[PDB]
Amino acid sequence: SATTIGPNTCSIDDYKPYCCQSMSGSASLGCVVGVIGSQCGASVKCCKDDVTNTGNSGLIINAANCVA
């Protein structure tokens, strides 16, 4: 993917635009907060929050807090 990330794509159901760096061998998606202007090459997910702790360098989302 190469979608442009901003507080518009995922911000509806209290969501954040998460750039999940899901690669070869990733049970937990390393979803870094999409910076306005950045592009998501991997799995861009619209997740709520999950927990903004224990995962600052790429939020460790349990993949169960997003619409799609």
Short mmCIF file of C-alpha atoms in Angstrom, two decimals:
data_model
loop_
_atom_site.label_atom_id
_atom_site.label_comp_id
_atom_site.label_asym_id
_atom_site.label_seq_id
_atom_site.Cartn_x
_atom_site.Cartn_y
_atom_site.Cartn_z
CA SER A 1 0.00 0.00 0.00
CA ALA A 2 0.94 3.69 -0.24
CA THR A 3 -2.02 5.42 1.36
CA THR A 4 -1.50 8.85 2.88
CA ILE A 5 -2.08 8.88 6.62
CA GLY A 6 -3.89 11.65 8.45
CA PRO A 7 -6.49 12.30 11.20
CA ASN A 8 -9.29 11.69 8.70
CA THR A 9 -8.96 8.12 7.46
CA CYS A 10 -9.31 6.47 10.86
CA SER A 11 -10.83 8.75 13.49
CA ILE A 12 -14.52 7.89 13.39
CA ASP A 13 -15.30 5.38 16.14
CA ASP A 14 -12.64 7.01 18.36
CA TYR A 15 -10.03 5.54 16.04
CA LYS A 16 -6.43 6.33 15.22
CA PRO A 17 -4.67 5.67 11.89
CA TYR A 18 -2.34 2.83 12.80
CA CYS A 19 0.51 1.90 10.49
CA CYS A 20 0.82 -1.74 11.49
CA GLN A 21 4.21 -3.07 10.43
CA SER A 22 2.95 -6.62 10.03
CA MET A 23 5.76 -8.53 8.35
CA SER A 24 7.03 -12.09 8.07
CA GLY A 25 6.54 -13.39 11.60
CA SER A 26 4.25 -10.88 13.30
CA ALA A 27 1.58 -12.20 15.66
CA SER A 28 1.16 -8.75 17.14
CA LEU A 29 0.97 -5.85 14.71
CA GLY A 30 3.48 -3.11 15.34
CA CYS A 31 1.06 -0.29 14.63
CA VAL A 32 2.89 3.02 14.84
CA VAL A 33 0.68 6.11 15.04
CA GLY A 34 0.31 7.44 11.53
CA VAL A 35 1.84 10.89 11.29
CA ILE A 36 -0.09 13.37 9.16
CA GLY A 37 1.66 13.20 5.81
CA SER A 38 3.23 9.77 6.20
CA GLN A 39 2.33 6.80 4.01
CA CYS A 40 1.39 3.32 5.16
CA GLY A 41 3.17 0.71 3.09
CA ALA A 42 2.01 -2.19 5.21
CA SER A 43 -1.34 -2.82 6.88
CA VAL A 44 -3.01 0.50 7.69
CA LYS A 45 -5.57 -0.27 10.39
CA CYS A 46 -8.25 1.88 11.96
CA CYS A 47 -7.94 0.83 15.60
CA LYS A 48 -9.35 2.58 18.66
CA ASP A 49 -6.40 2.62 21.05
CA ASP A 50 -6.17 -0.72 22.86
CA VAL A 51 -3.66 0.60 25.35
CA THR A 52 -1.18 3.44 24.85
CA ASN A 53 1.35 1.75 27.13
CA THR A 54 3.82 -1.13 26.79
CA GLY A 55 4.29 -0.36 23.12
CA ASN A 56 5.39 3.20 22.42
CA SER A 57 7.80 2.35 19.61
CA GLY A 58 4.99 0.92 17.54
CA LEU A 59 1.79 0.26 19.46
CA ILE A 60 1.36 -3.45 20.08
CA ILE A 61 -2.29 -3.71 19.10
CA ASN A 62 -3.95 -7.08 19.75
CA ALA A 63 -5.60 -6.64 16.32
CA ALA A 64 -8.98 -6.77 18.08
CA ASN A 65 -9.63 -3.05 18.50
CA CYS A 66 -10.12 -2.07 14.87
CA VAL A 67 -12.90 -2.10 12.28
CA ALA A 68 -10.68 -3.19 9.41
#
